[PDB]
C-alpha cells in the first residue's frame, strides 16, 4: 500500500488519515527513517497538542545525543524562539523569566504583563493566539533567531493540523516559505470537535485543495 | 569560518601574548618550550581529555598561584551563508549571540587557584560580547562545546 | 587603642563609630581574623546597604572556596531564605521565580503579585518592609530553613545599623535569639539622613542603651 | 549521621542488589569479584577522581549498553541536634529538602550509553523524595557534593 511511498519521499508531505488509521505508527516510522538516512548535524522537531502523545513518541523513539525536540507546539515556541531571543528583538528590559488567571483582551497588555508582572500573558478570546503571534514577531526582528532556526532543524513533524488557529498556520508557513524548512503534516479533516478552543478547519482543507508544493497521500488502514 | 586571534595570560612561560591566526597555522622557532606550551593551551581550551584534569601549581606563571589564567579564542562568522561549520557552531549556541555582533564569537577559559584544596578549577564561557560572557551549559562530564569540536592530536612519539 | 580589644573578642559586639573612623578597615580586619581563627565548616555573612561597599569588601577579602555571603541585606533574604524555602512554608503553588512599578499598600497583595504576576512585590509606604517580613514569616514556618541557617553561618556582620527599619531589626533579633547566631553591629548614631527611606534610628540607640549581652566599643580614630 | 541502604542495578555483575548498611561495614565471601565491584560502585558514587572518567561498555551488565545504571545511597538525618556531620551535609544542601521528609536524604547516580559517541555519561542527583531528585549544582570540574565527602582509599598494593 501507500505506506511505502511515504518513507521513500523526502520533502513536503500531507497524510489525510482518519481515525483508526495508525498515525502514530507512520509518524514514528518516518521519523526513524529520516534520522537514520541523514548523517549531518541537523535535527527534527515533533509538535503535538497533548503531553501524552509527546511522551508516547519520546518513549518509542528512544535515546540519542542528537538534539531533537519532541513535545507540544506551545512548548516549541517558548523553548526555541521566545525565551532565548525575546531581548534581542525588543530590548534588554523585556524579561525571559516566566512560569506560564492573568488573561486579558489585548496584545499590548500581554506585553505589559510579561514585562511588569514577569509572567506569560494570555487572551480571553480563544480565537486569537498570543504565543504564536509574539513568536512570529520575534522571528521577523531577530536575525540570530532565524539563523538558529535554520541551522538547527531540517524537518518539522506536525500532527492534528485541523485543530490549528490562524497564528499557528502563519508561523508554520513562515518557516516553510521564508526559512525553507520541510514540513510533514498529518490530520483528520472530520475531527474538528475542538472548535471550542478556536480551531480553524479551513486551513487544513485549503492546504489539501490548493497546495502545489505539497505531496498528498491518504491512509485507509 | 575562520580563526582570528588568541590571547594567553599567566599560563606557564606565557605572561601576556597576543597571536593572530588563520585556518592553517605553522609555528617555528628556537625556544622549543613555548612551542609545546602553545599547543597545550590549545588542548586545554578545546580538548576535554586534557581539560578533564585541572591546573597544577606549575601551570601558573612564575609558580605564583595568586594570578588568574586566561585563554581566549576569537572566531569570524562572516560566511554563515556559504559555510556549514558556522551552522554547526550556531546550532549549539542559542541566546549567547546578539544581532549587533552577529559576525564575531568568543570562547574563554578562566582558572583561579584554591590554596586550601590545592586545586585549579577550569570554567569555560562563550559570548559575542567580550564584556558579557556566560558559562557553557552541560550535564555530568559533558559540555555543550564538546558537541562541536573534535581535536585530533598527532605525535610520532607517544 | 581599643582596635586591639575588638579582634580579641568573640561574640556579640557593637562599634559606635562616627564618620571618618575607618569602619571598613576594622570590619575587614575582624572578618579576616574570624576566618583565620576558625577551622570548621561554618561561614560568615556581611550585609551592607549599597553594592559599592559590598564590592569593596569582596575585593579586599580575596578569593576562597569557603562560602561566605558578601552583599546587600536585600539580597541576603532573597538568596538564603525566600527563594529556596518559599514553597516549603506556604505551598508548591507559590513561585520561586522573580526579577525584583507594581507596588501596593497591603501585604496580601504582595503575595498575590508574587503568585499570579510572578514578580516580587513592594510597598508604597516606605515605613513598612515586605521582604523582611516575608523572610521572618518563612523562617517561622519552615524547619529546614532554620536548620540551613543554623548549619551554614556562625557570625553575621552588619554595618550602618542606624538606617534599619523595624522589620530588619525583628529578623536580625530573631536570628540572634532564637537561632543563637552571633552579631557584629557597626553604626553612626548621627547619620540618619536616610530617614526618607523609613529608617528608624531608635533601634540602634535602644540597643546601645539597653542591651546586656552586647559588648560596646567606640572608635575616635 | 548514619548510612542506611544502597541499591545497584545493571552495573557489572550486579543486576538488582539491595544492601542494608551502617557506619562500620565489613564485606566477606568467596566471590572476590562482587566484593571489588561493591567498592568500585562506592568510589564511582562518592569519588571524583574515579567518576572523572565515564562508564565503558564493560561496565554495563551483560555488556548490554541499552540498559541504565542506577546507584542510590540512603542516609538518616535523625540526629541533627547531636551530630555535626548532619550540619556539614545540610549546609551544602538548601532547597532539595522538605520539612515532611526532614530525616531522610538520597544521593543517586544515573548513566545511559551513547552509541554514536561510545561514551557513558554520569549525572548525579540528590533529594529528600526519591520521586523528585534534582541535579547537584557545580561549576567547571567541581561539584557541590565534592565539598562534603572525603574518600580515602587504602590498598597494600597499588
UniProtKB/Swiss-Prot annotation, chains A, C:
Q: Where does ATP bind?
A: 17-24
> What residue range is the signal peptide?
none
Result of knocking out the encoding gene = When this gene is missing the Gabija type I system does not confer resistance to SpBeta in B.subtilis. When this gene is missing the Gabija type I system does not confer resistance to T7 in E.coli.
Taxonomic classification: Bacteria, Bacillati, Bacillota, Bacilli, Bacillales
Instruction: Give the family, as the similarity comment puts it.
Output: Belongs to the helicase family.
Q: Which stretches make up the UvrD-like helicase ATP-binding domain?
A: 1-221
Record's function text: Component of antiviral defense system Gabija type I, composed of GajA and GajB. Expression of Gabija type I in B.subtilis (strain BEST7003) confers resistance to phages phi105, phi29, rho14, SpBeta and SBSphiC. Expression of Gabija type I in E.coli B (strain ATCC 11303) confers resistance to phage T7. May be a helicase or contribute to GajA activation.
According to the record's subunit comment, the protein's assembly and interactions are: Homodimer. Interacts with GajA; 2 GajB dimers dock at opposite sides of the GajA complex to form a 4:4 GajA-GajB assembly (GajAB). GajAB interacts with Bacillus phage Phi3T Gad1 protein; this interaction forms a 4:4:8 GajAB-Gad1 complex and leads to GajAB inhibition.
| Domain statement | Contains a UvrD-like helicase domain.
Q: What is this protein called?
A: Gabija protein GajB
For the site labelled Interaction with GajA, the residues are: 144, 147
Question: Shown portion of the whole protein?
Answer: 1 to 224 of 494
From Swiss-Prot, chains B, D:
Q: What happens when the gene is disrupted?
A: When this gene is missing the Gabija type I system does not confer resistance to SpBeta in B.subtilis.
Which span of the entire protein is present here?
Answer: 1 to 158 of 578
Domain comment as written in the entry: The N-terminal ATPase-like domain seems to have lost ATPase activity, but may still bind nucleotides. The C-terminal Toprim (topoisomerase/primase) domain probably has the endonuclease activity, but when expressed alone (residues 348-578) has not activity, showing it requires the N-terminal ATPase-like domain for function.
Q: Where does ATP bind?
A: 32-36
Assembly and partners are described as:
Homotetramer. Forms the core of the anti-phage defense complex. Interacts with GajB; 2 GajB dimers dock at opposite sides of the GajA complex to form a 4:4 GajA-GajB assembly (GajAB). GajAB interacts with Bacillus phage Phi3T Gad1 protein; this interaction forms a 4:4:8 GajAB-Gad1 complex and leads to GajAB inhibition.
Q: For site (Interaction with GajB), what residue positions does UniProt give?
A: 94, 97
Q: What does this protein do?
A: Component of antiviral defense system Gabija type I, composed of GajA and GajB. Has no detected ATPase activity. Expression of Gabija type I in B.subtilis (strain BEST7003) confers resistance to phages phi105, phi29, rho14, SpBeta and SBSphiC. Expression of Gabija type I in E.coli B (strain ATCC 11303) confers resistance to phage T7.
- Effect on the protein upon substituting residue 35 to A: Retains endonuclease activity
- Name of this protein: Endonuclease GajA
Task: Give the encoding gene's name.
Answer: gajA
Q: Which organism is it from?
A: Bacillus cereus (strain VD045)
Amino acid at each position: 500500500m501507500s505506506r511505502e511511498q511515504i518513507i521513500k519521499d523526502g520533502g513536503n508531505i500531507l497524510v489525510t488519515a482518519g481515525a483508526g488509521s495508525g498515525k502514530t505508527t507512520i509518524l514514528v516510522s518516518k521519523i526513524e527513517a529520516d534520522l537514520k538516512e541523514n548523517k549531518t548535524h541537523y535535527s527534527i522537531a515533533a509538535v503535538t497538542f497533548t503531553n501524552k502523545a509527546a511522551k508516547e513518541i519520546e518513549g518509542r523513539l528512544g535515546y540519542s545525543s542528537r538534539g531533537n525536540f519532541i513535545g507540544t507546539n506551545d512548548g516549541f515556541v517558548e523553548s526555541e524562539i521566545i525565551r532565548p531571543f525575546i531581548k534581542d528583538a525588543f530590548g534588554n528590559d523585556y524579561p525571559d523569566n516566566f512560569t506560564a488567571d492573568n488573561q486579558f483582551a489585548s496584545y499590548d497588555k500581554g506585553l505589559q504583563v510579561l514585562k511588569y508582572q514577569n509572567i506569560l500573558g494570555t487572551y480571553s478570546n480563544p480565537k486569537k493566539n498570543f504565543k504564536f503571534q509574539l513568536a512570529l514577531d520575534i522571528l521577523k526582528k531577530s536575525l540570530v533567531a532565524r539563523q538558529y532556526i535554520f541551522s538547527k532543524y531540517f524537518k518539522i513533524f506536525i500532527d492534528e493540523y485541523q485543530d490549528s488557529d490562524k497564528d499557528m498556520h502563519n508561523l508554520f508557513m513562515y518557516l516553510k516559505d521564508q526559512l525553507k524548512i520541510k514540513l510533514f503534516i498529518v490530520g483528520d479533516p472530520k475531527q474538528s470537535i475542538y472548535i471550542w478552543r478556536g480551531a480553524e478547519p479551513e486551513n487544513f482543507n485549503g492546504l489539501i485543495e490548493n497546495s502545489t508544493d505539497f505531496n498528498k497521500y491518504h491512509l485507509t488502514s | 569560518m575562520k580563526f582570528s586571534n588568541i590571547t594567553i595570560k599567566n599560563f606557564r612561560n606565557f605572561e601576556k601574548v597576543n597571536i593572530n591566526l588563520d585556518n592553517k597555522n605553522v609555528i617555528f622557532g628556537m625556544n622549543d618550550i613555548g612551542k609545546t606550551n602553545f599547543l597545550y593551551a590549545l588542548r586545554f581550551l578545546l580538548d576535554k581529555e586534557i581539560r578533564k584534569f585541572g591546573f597544577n601549581k606549575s601551570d601558573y606563571h612564575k609558580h605564583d598561584t595568586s594570578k588568574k589564567i586566561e585563554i581566549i579564542l576569537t572566531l569570524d562568522l562572516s560566511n554563515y551563508e556559504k559555510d556549514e561549520d558556522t551552522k554547526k557552531l550556531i546550532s549549539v549556541v542559542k541566546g549567547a549571540r546578539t544581532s549587533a555582533n552577529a559576525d564575531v564569537f568568543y570562547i574563554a577559559l578562566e582558572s583561579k587557584y584554591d590554596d586550601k584544596e590545592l586545586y585549579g578549577n577550569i570554567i569555560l564561557k562563550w559570548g559575542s560580547e567580550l564584556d558579557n560572557l556566560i558559562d557553557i551549559p552541560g550535564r555530568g562530564n559533558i559540555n555543550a562545546l564538546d558537541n562541536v569540536f573534535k581535536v585530533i592530536y598527532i605525535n610520532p612519539l607517544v
